[PDB]
């Protein structure tokens, strides 16, 4: 996976997550400069890890003013933007117990802000004929007990990816979505006691490949879809879930014999 | 379609539309008492045509207080609710031009308010072990130029229908969705000049059956899903789109010959 | 579910299964005469159960001559056919171990014969402006370990339903598919020891409604789609699986806590 | 797209097509040795252009003996196979007019032969822990007037891809599918008069990106899925259709205005 994006500029929302850092590293390795927009402070450290190749801009994407200031800063330090990766999300989700206020907050962060960040960067993507990668999940294709806000948000992101693709094609912008499964996480790392083999064995029940996915494995699909190798891919959902979404409630274990 | 729902109480949000009127008539004909919730005053007239069997309650479903008051009125005049048909929606939609405020408004009306209305009625549906029908669209499965808010809202309703089904099954409540295509509507009647054969001529290009759907044809599917005949149907999306969703950009006309 | 199909004639392939008998009973109750086409001899008993309302014609649907003779017999004893329910299938399936010969046999029985039986009845369905119901499964939407021939066959039936819908619409014929989950079966009845409560508790892990489906519950959806209440439903897949298809490998039980 | 597959051996059925040629070139450029299996003699010329790195073996994949001999020749000249690209297909397709014999022939070539070729190569892919790429189409997700056999065959390939992924995961073999839209082809070049801009003008109505796809653009996705960058991708369908599959019968042009 030796793609060449020398001189290009990329924007990565929610770049403080392990997937976010893998996406940033993938872009830097390809020669691109990256601006990380996130509310989490840890992002700063990530940016410093790449010295002048990556810049961190703490941004509340629900604030239009914060987005305008972030794009101004990107223009001042890096230049015109070619790639946008919308990875920002909130895990505010208590199913039926979540309130109307929680619903609107989660939708604003997970969905509406993707529109506003794309809009603030649209003229750049138009001039550069760039590409956009949004993030769905296996949760956008299936129901999970007790989780409403994030699955519904991600299903909505899927449709938004299609509509953006259609209405952005005229300007030469490609828009796709990436649908991962269980990926090694900071949260999983802490609840598991930083024990990867056990977390993998738990995940084996829901992934044909028998483990959690690596952030790098997700980042590869992001970079492919951004690159010109995917020049005839727009509006598509690229699954990187180790086979999660081909299975139903029976999993990968026989079910008929239980009847006897 | 001669189902018996004698004595059962149904609530139909967005009941002032042609679809809503057809659903109300289908329910009354089946012996049910109906509460019409809508922000449109036309609903009043509709209810009056059915004398004491149908009630109208002008409701802004974005107001929690309005929902509590609507449920109180239903309790006073009709009683415990068995069926909920979430048909309320807004067509506030300017594609990419729609603002953040427009996004959150359309999501509040189309999606979050469905949750709040379901929550206010949940104890009724649990005691009665009733059923819920949400409304998706052909717009939740495909992209349409210049339309973002309503397609995305309906794509979100589809996932919400699945997650509602899962977390409500334990209480014996079924939840499904209905996906109609182009159906005869007030707006189409106004742009058509109240010319149905002309509008049918336009819609033939997008429906295998060569016309717009009738509101009653949609109401039939709604009624089936509410009834006990659908007693093993939960979390499903039932299309009533005259073949719209089986087609792609080629429509129903051959396309290869055009290359010669 | 009191539909009126007086005087109509229906053909039910594979009518010897419990689902088949439920579909036949549903049609008879609606006033229709039914011809059961099947290779299984038990069908004869089923037909006798309805005296002169149902006729049995032992038919090898892989034999074109047998199909022509069956349609001749239907015309001699019953008349012009209005409804066709393609329920015939084989469970010849050993996954990767199944041979090319097994593959072609299973595809011939499960798929190609549906085309030939529709073709032999096409002029009837055209004159009567009838409807067709094919049978998919939850197996057409997901992968199941060790089962290739039947899932692939059913996925192919799904696409065939769409293509038939498109190319039959001009003649006023509607074509849909029904997708059930685990339904109480003869095979399940024998391996379970005719113990329904235990089989239901096994199935609860894969159906939100916590049991196997009843054949009658599937038959209701078949009859709806055949009837004129579904007059704007063509090319659609109507799930009657108690919520099986809304779930993934996590089932309906929490999965995050296992990580701790 | 600078992947390193040095020393690895790939097999490409149906390699005489433009897609196949692009995939062969992509693999060779990545350092792989390629075996071209096809019934078309044009493949011979293709292989000769790459001297000793690419081999051509004229094969009727419906003949088990031919497959065994093709694997023997691959073993003699190149060695153990790591990658399999199932691209062989027939366009024998007359919709409803196609006979039972035509159905079984098209299914044998398009679908069952994929299984037999995978089975003959399975021990290789298991030892090498390789990957398989099947070919679906935009025709597996939608209905097209007058075309049954190929759309249904491809819909079946989609499910076969999922079931292969599941039952091959234990052996470390990934299996995915690629779904292209209208791609430049020999047949289009013949009906077009070798006029690419004209054919692009026709295809713009069915692809957001306003043209036919290039064979190389499809080959890029094939190569990504074969490579270790897709190491958490199994059982997925990767669309490379220029936005075809996000559209319905309305295409990318507004349709509501037509009603006025």
Numbering used by the authors:
A (entry chain B), B (entry chain A), C (entry chain B), D (entry chain A): 1 to 260
The authors write:
Short-chain dehydrogenase/reductase enzymes are a large protein family with >60,000 members involved in numerous biosynthesis pathways. Here, an SDR family member from A. baumannii (Uniprot ID: A0A0M3FP68) was cloned, expressed, purified, and crystallised.
Crystals diffracted to 2.4 Å, permitting structure determination. Each monomer contains a central β -sheet (β1- β7), sandwiched between two groups of α- helices (α1-α2-α12-α13 and α3-α5-α6-α7-α8-α9-α10), with an overall topology of β1-α1-β2-α2-β3-α3-β4-α4-α5-α6-α7-β5-α8-α9-α10-β6-α11-α12-α13-β7-α14. After structural elucidation it was discovered that Gln69 was missing, and investigation revealed this error was introduced in the original design of the plasmid. The structure presented in this study presented no evidence of the cofactor (or substrate) bound in the well described binding pocket. This analysis also revealed that uniquely, the C-terminus of the SDR in this study, spanning residues 246VMGPEGLQPAIPRLAE261 extended diagonally and bound the adjacent protomer by interacting with loop regions 186–248, a region that plays a role in cofactor and substrate binding. Specifically, this interaction was mediated by Val246 hydrogen bonding with Ala143, Glu250 hydrogen bonding with Gln144, and Ala260 hydrogen bonding with Lys198, as well as a salt bridge interaction between Arg258 and Asp205.
